[PDB]
């Protein structure tokens, strides 16, 4: 556990190493550095106070835990209520107007 | 599960089915409590105790003084007085019953001190 209950590698840069966190994408990784206005150095070489200053600011977003829970309840909302989009999840099939005649190998494989 | 007192009694019976007190070689058994020692010399054929030596005897309670429990030095005194109490009765041979406890420790000092003079075992 480097930060956020995940062991991040220590060789990569800072921008392209927070992205392994489940709640941090490519834009959020930049917004954090831009808010802290610090230079994108290595992961291991970073100071303690600066690295400490990251550990306090990252916790403001839906990083992990509630993020995966906020999604799973949302998909659970559609299943119990039996929307059209909810039944397709139960069927293991898409719900955004895709054609199902010759494609959708992702969900069919993920049965 | 089994407690210390229960396992102690089992270790004493497995010993007793081999050692047996007789007029020619009585049975010397020991009982150590959390605060006292105790010894008996028995002829099992007669079911009678010939001699004994306890921690509560006046001839030795005035001499020794322990706070928590009887030490190795105490056992050396019990083996000494019981020996002098045996030779006056006219018996030398004896079978050693270790009371279910291991031979190592204070039980060894009691046997050696008693074996140091007078007795044959």
């Amino acid at each position: 556990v480097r930060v956020g209950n995940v062991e991040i590698p220590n060789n990569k840069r800072v921008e392209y190493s927070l992205q392994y966190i489940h709640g941090i994408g490519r834009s959020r990784a930049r917004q954090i550095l831009c808010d802290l206005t610090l230079e994108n150095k290595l992961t291991k070489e970073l100071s303690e106070d600066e690295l400490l200053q990251v550990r306090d600011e990252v916790t403001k977003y839906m990083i992990e835990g509630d993020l995966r829970r906020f999604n799973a309840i949302a998909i659970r909302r559609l299943k119990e209520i039996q929307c059209y989009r909810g039944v397709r999840h139960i069927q293991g099939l898409p719900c955004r107007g895709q054609r199902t005649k010759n494609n959708c190998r992702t969900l069919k494989r993920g049965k | 599960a089994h407690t210390r007192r229960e396992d102690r009694t089992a270790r004493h019976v497995r010993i007793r089915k081999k050692v047996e007190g007789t007029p020619e070689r009585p049975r010397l058994c020991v009982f150590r409590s959390n605060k006292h020692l105790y010894v008996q010399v028995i002829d099992d054929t007669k079911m009678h105790t010939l001699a004994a030596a306890s921690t509560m005897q006046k001839a030795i309670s005035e001499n020794i003084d322990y706070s928590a429990g009887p030490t190795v030095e105490v056992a050396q005194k019990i083996g000494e007085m019981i020996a002098k109490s045996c030779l006056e009765k006219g018996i030398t041979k004896v079978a050693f019953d270790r009371g279910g406890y291991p031979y190592h420790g204070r039980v060894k000092a009691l046997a050696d001190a008693a074996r140091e003079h007078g007795l044959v075992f």
């Binding site: 062991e7 992990e64 835990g65 995966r68 | -």
Partner: protein
Amino acid sequence: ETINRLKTNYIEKMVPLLKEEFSYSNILEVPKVVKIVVNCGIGDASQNAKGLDAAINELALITGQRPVKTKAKTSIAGFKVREGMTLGIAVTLRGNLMYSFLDRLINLALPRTRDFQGVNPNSFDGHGNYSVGFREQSVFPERGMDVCITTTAKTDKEAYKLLSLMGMPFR
């Protein structure tokens, strides 16, 4: 900051507190932790020695005490094993290690588990004893394990009251 927290916090604060909860007629009727048995079963331990000799050292650093190569009680072909071969990895924690281990449990390893929302309070067996299951051991700051806590409690209520005071976050 003190040396031993649980050992001192228990005798001074908890025993007057837990006695008032159930109103025991004697102080010796209070329950207390006897031991903590940490099991780790591997069926494929008979194949490799590196995975065996290494994992035995992994738990040792977590506990400060060597594990034990636990052997099979009987042979059976359903899982392709033989009698006398090692199947499980176990160890006994008593005295100060069980408290020092518990400090490393509630505060170091148990919080670092992914998606943590408290341990099941229904894991009691019905005689005061308690158990825990893990998938990983890297949560300890140094594969799974079955931690079996023993207690002298008759019912589970005083145990649940006992364990809850020493952290043990229950849902």
